[PDB]
């Protein structure tokens, strides 16, 4: 898992507001 | 397909006008949240995706935020308000470039309605301050306690004006009928230094009282007819219209 | 894309004039917090990151702090208040230099 | 970057002027705490670290303490308050020399703000006490109990002034109408030694009373017209403008 | 895990 791939996974997972 | 128009400063913010018979095309990329701008005072009823899990939906009043959450998120978002139904075609851009940070909606009818009222307000104010086409009656007599007298009394056919000096207490002014009975009459205080009492009636006789002193004002040119008030305001250059409809 | 302009005593403090039709590029380095300073009498309604996990968000009244919490944290922050809506293009700078300690707004 | 200047006694106490356009360099060695205080009566609101875990934060009231908690603690600190916002740059120092035990500020911006308001107050007071183009009436007579009499009476067209000596009690002053009835008139006491009673009306006759002694004062040059109050204040060089709009 | 790497980890983790 290259950092860009993990970044894309993070971008897909993220919600709009944390909390 | 109504492609939004990018702003001259930055291409990220795009403006397109609402149309009931068309869908707006959006070019969204990964990891950016698009701010969908709603009209003031709308009512979000519901919304509907063709693929719910593809996008993340957050709303607060009239502020809609959407971001992609799944790969190949090519679907639609339909938002219905109390007054209209918004139609989006959520096409997921593939290069992560040229996002749409905001999509502001322009509404023609509300533009026209909001712009006309300001012109009406300015014209109405100018027309009140215009104050032309008035005849002035100056044939006024007085007899009684002259120490509470005005320095000037006149009428323009709609109101009667009593002008008092700077050092004079403003008295109370009463309407005298045919048999000599006195009754209340509305008054407003006008002038640069609040030195004029304008009463909202033209009468042949008036009574001025302050304390235990009384003065009688006589209209020696009483016109029984006067100018009719067809406009509903104090001037013939402004009209009072029934907004309430109903 | 209005890049904010630094003060003449230090570059760590930038300023920008508000514009409802343009974004503000924000340059974030690792390990710093950005004090974004809002106008007085302004009530916060809602904000929406590009990635809630790529940045830490703190707000007390009209003060805003953002701080990167993950690598390659290139997102956008849209905070919307009663008077207006702000736009930031958060772009993480890998060299850990030339941060922006405070962003201060101007209004025409 | 503001490098603070050390005191001439010890290098561990440093000073710098607050500047809302520049950050202060703080050099922290491992194992000591840098004491920081804010200006008296300042409301601490919030703070934010670059690394919440690399440094500690102890605060009670206006006293702020920090200390490095981790290796390589190179971050910032933004302490926001109700009037300002301190921006620090914390740089953990490897060799544990040249520590800071106390950071202190000298605040010129608060003085620069406090001085402007004095300038505005002085400007408005100058506008009020710029009295010019005034006419004074001195034709006043008196009859009655001369033991409560003023040493001087005059009016400027808007107010009437009665000057009393230093050994005299200040009496009560009443407004006399044409029928001879007295009534309350508002007054303000002016002068360097509070020796003048300024009533807010110009009248042909006044009544002065103190106990069972009465003095009558007559205006022999009464001007009914007066000077009209176009501005809403007591001077023609200051205007009372509507702030609420509405 | 070099100390600078741990410093970067602490920078990313903390609030």
């Amino acid at each position: 898992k290259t950092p860009y791939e993990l970044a894309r996974e993070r971008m897909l997972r993220s919600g709009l507001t944390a909390g | 397909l109504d492609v939004p128009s990018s702003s001259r400063y930055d291409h990220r913010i795009r403006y397109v006008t609402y149309n009931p018979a068309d869908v707006v095309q959006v070019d969204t990329v990964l990891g950016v949240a698009t701010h969908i701008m709603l009209e003031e005072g709308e009512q979000y009823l519901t919304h509907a995706f063709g693929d719910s899990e593809a996008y993340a939906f957050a709303r607060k009043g009239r502020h809609i935020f959407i971001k992609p959450q799944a790969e190949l998120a090519n679907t639609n978002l339909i938002v219905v308000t109390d007054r209209r139904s918004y139609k989006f075609r959520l096409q997921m851009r593939n290069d992560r470039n040229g996002a749409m940070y905001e999509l502001a909606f322009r509404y023609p009818d509300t533009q026209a309605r909001q712009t006309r009222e300001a012109n009406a307000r300015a014209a109405v104010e100018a027309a009140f301050e215009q104050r032309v086409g008035a005849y002035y009656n100056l044939k006024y007599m007085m007899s009684g306690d002259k120490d509470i007298a005005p320095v000037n009394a006149w009428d323009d056919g709609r109101f009667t004006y009593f002008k008092f000096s700077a050092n004079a207490d403003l008295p109370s002014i009463y309407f005298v009928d045919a048999e000599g009975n006195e009754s209340l009459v509305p008054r407003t205080t006008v002038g640069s230094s609040n030195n004029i009492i304008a009463v909202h009636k033209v009468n042949p006789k008036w009574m001025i009282r302050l304390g235990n002193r009384a003065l009688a004002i006589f209209n020696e040119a009483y016109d029984p007819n006067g100018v009719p008030n067809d406009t509903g305001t104090a001037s013939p250059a402004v009209r009072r219209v029934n907004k309430g409809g109903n």
Side-chain angles (χ1 to χ4, degrees), chain B residues 20-21 38 58 90 147 157 163 168 173 176 182-183 190 204 210:
Chain B
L38 281 183
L90 306 201
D147 60 79
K163 184 177 180 180
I173 296 165
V176 167
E182 296 177 356
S183 62
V190 298
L210 180 50

Side-chain angles (χ1 to χ4, degrees), chain B residues 84-97:
Chain B
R84 34 191 178 263
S85 300
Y86 294 61
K87 286 167 278 294
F88 303 88
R89 191 226 185 186
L90 306 201
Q91 182 176 5
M92 183 177 177
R93 184 70 71 81
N94 59 5
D95 64 353
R96 195 184 158 92
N97 281 312

Side-chain angles (χ1 to χ4, degrees), chain B residues 161-211:
Chain B
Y161 304 90
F162 307 93
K163 184 177 180 180
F164 298 84
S165 47
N167 281 347
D169 290 351
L170 288 199
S172 191
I173 296 165
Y174 292 103
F175 169 100
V176 167
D177 73 354
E179 274 170 4
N181 302 299
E182 296 177 356
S183 62
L184 312 171
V185 62
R187 55 180 260 183
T188 189
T189 302
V190 298
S192 53
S193 54
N194 307 107
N195 54 343
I196 300 172
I197 305 172
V199 294
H200 298 343
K201 185 65 177 175
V202 165
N203 194 57
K205 195 186 167 186
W206 300 101
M207 176 66 60
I208 295 189
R209 301 187 172 279
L210 180 50

Side-chain angles (χ1 to χ4, degrees), chain B residues 1-4 16-26 76-79 84-89 103 105-106:
Chain B
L1 292 174
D2 267 340
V3 164
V16 66
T17 68
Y18 187 102
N19 184 238
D22 207 353
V23 301
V24 63
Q25 154 73 50
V26 61
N76 73 17
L77 164 64
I78 295 171
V79 172
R84 34 191 178 263
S85 300
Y86 294 61
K87 286 167 278 294
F88 303 88
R89 191 226 185 186
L103 183 48
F105 280 88
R106 294 200 210 110

Side-chain angles (χ1 to χ4, degrees), chain B residues 235-246:
Chain B
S235 74
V238 186
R239 169 146 279 151
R240 186 202 57 187
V241 288
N242 309 348
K243 149 202 291 181
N246 215 330

Side-chain angles (χ1 to χ4, degrees), chain B residues 20-91:
Chain B
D22 207 353
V23 301
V24 63
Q25 154 73 50
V26 61
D27 303 279
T28 176
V29 298
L30 172 63
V32 310
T34 298
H35 172 202
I36 294 320
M37 252 305 298
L38 281 183
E39 201 175 49
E40 296 88 330
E42 272 156 305
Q43 193 66 32
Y44 167 84
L45 294 174
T46 61
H47 73 285
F49 290 96
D51 184 339
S52 168
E53 310 196 300
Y55 285 92
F57 193 92
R59 196 205 47 107
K60 174 69 173 295
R62 57 188 281 261
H63 283 302
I64 303 187
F65 284 120
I66 64 166
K67 65 186 308 292
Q69 276 200 328
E71 283 267 13
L72 302 104
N74 304 280
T75 184
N76 73 17
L77 164 64
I78 295 171
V79 172
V80 301
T81 58
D82 62 358
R83 64 192 74 189
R84 34 191 178 263
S85 300
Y86 294 61
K87 286 167 278 294
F88 303 88
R89 191 226 185 186
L90 306 201
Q91 182 176 5

Side-chain angles (χ1 to χ4, degrees), chain A residues 3-4 7 10-18:
Chain A
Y4 183 76
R10 185 273 312 280
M11 293 180 183
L12 275 73
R13 291 191 294 100
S14 48
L16 276 160
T17 67

Side-chain angles (χ1 to χ4, degrees), chain B residues 7-13 15 31-35 60 63 65 67 96 101-102:
Chain B
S7 178
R8 64 190 50 151
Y9 297 106
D10 183 20
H11 72 267
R12 271 80 168 276
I13 316 170
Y15 318 129
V32 310
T34 298
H35 172 202
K60 174 69 173 295
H63 283 302
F65 284 120
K67 65 186 308 292
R96 195 184 158 92
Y101 278 40
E102 321 206 0

